[PDB]
Amino acid sequence: PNLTEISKKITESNAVVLAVKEVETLLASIDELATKAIGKKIGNNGLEANQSKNTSLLSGAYAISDLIAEKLNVLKNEELKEKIDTAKQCSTEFTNKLKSEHAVLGLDNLTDDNAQRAILKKHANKDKGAAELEKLFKAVENLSKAAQDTLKNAVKELTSPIVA
Amino acid sequence: PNLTEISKKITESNAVVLAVKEVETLLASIDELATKAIGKKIGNNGLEANQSKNTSLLSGAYAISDLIAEKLNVLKNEELKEKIDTAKQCSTEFTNKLKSEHAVLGLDNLTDDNAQRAILKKHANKDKGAAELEKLFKAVENLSKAAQDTLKNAVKELTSPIVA
Numbered sequence A, B: 001p002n003l004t005e006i007s008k009k010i011t012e013s014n015a016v017v018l019a020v021k022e023v024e025t026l027l028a029s030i031d032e033l034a035t036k037a038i039g040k041k042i043g044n045n046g047l048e049a050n051q052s053k054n055t056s057l058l059s060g061a062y063a064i065s066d067l068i069a070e071k072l073n074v075l076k077n078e079e080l081k082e083k084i085d086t087a088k089q090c091s092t093e094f095t096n097k098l099k100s101e102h103a104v105l106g107l108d109n110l111t112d113d114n115a116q117r118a119i120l121k122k123h124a125n126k127d128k129g130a131a132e133l134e135k136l137f138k139a140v141e142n143l144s145k146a147a148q149d150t151l152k153n154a155v156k157e158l159t160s161p162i163v164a
Helices: A004-035 A055-073 A081-100 A112-119 A128-154 B005-039 B054-072 B081-100 B112-119 B130-156
Strands: A039-041 A048-051 B040-043 B046-049
Touching: A004 A055, A004 A112, A004 A128, A004 B005, A004 B046, A004 B130, A039 B054, A039 B081, A039 B112, A048 B054, A055 A081, A055 A112, A055 B005, A055 B046, A055 B054, A055 B112, A081 A128, A112 A128, A128 B005, A128 B112, B005 B054, B005 B130, B046 B130, B054 B081, B081 B112, B081 B130
Parallel strands: none
Antiparallel strands: A039 A048, B040 B046
């Protein structure tokens, strides 16, 4: 089958899957910060309660959001360009929302509720980033599905006839 | 070549590469927190100075370290078991070091220097986690190389004769 030169199709469609997972995992880390570290402090047993001091925690989410923008800014693939752009745009709006809410997410005694309105996707109130975060989550999700299936083709069209 | 059933060898040796990258990216996020968010606050322009308030930031690193342990705890592969175990062990010691230093990393006005001694690998002083973090970094790095090369085999042995 094409001298099985499907390798190039498999190695490259893979570098995409890899690149996107990275962005995926970075979102998952922000979500871990959100669901596990908000209003918490490092305790002798592990994490425990410490409310209204999520300022630096928020700076961490922002940082990871910047790294996320960087990654997408460099993700290049013609057939996927679409899904990549929307993801990139969501990335921007999410980072931009946090920024505009700097007067609160940047103030020292940041309360948990306010933090969650910024980085906790399932929070009842999402008027400080969560909403945008959510969309960034979905965008990357579809960008992922789109690339993962592409990979499966190059791999599965290995145990199929040549041409059609 | 083995009815090109190398697919199974490629799809599986890939699920390993994927799983490990995830763990890799999680370390990279902790490092981003370390090199970009310590002693910072979300500002109208982006991140800016705000020293001695890295408590919640540290809770985030701890959280991501817990998620990291979880991932490795579930990473299973016979031929790699070795490199996986050492990584898992480094994971434990790193998380355990942060925990034992809870009296400082869990106190509200955590100074930047103290934070960096915990999660900044290149810091001059690494007596609060950095040292362990570093090792966790190297362990996963080798676990990665080991799996990535494995993948290349299953892919490259696609454009090579059957058997030997």
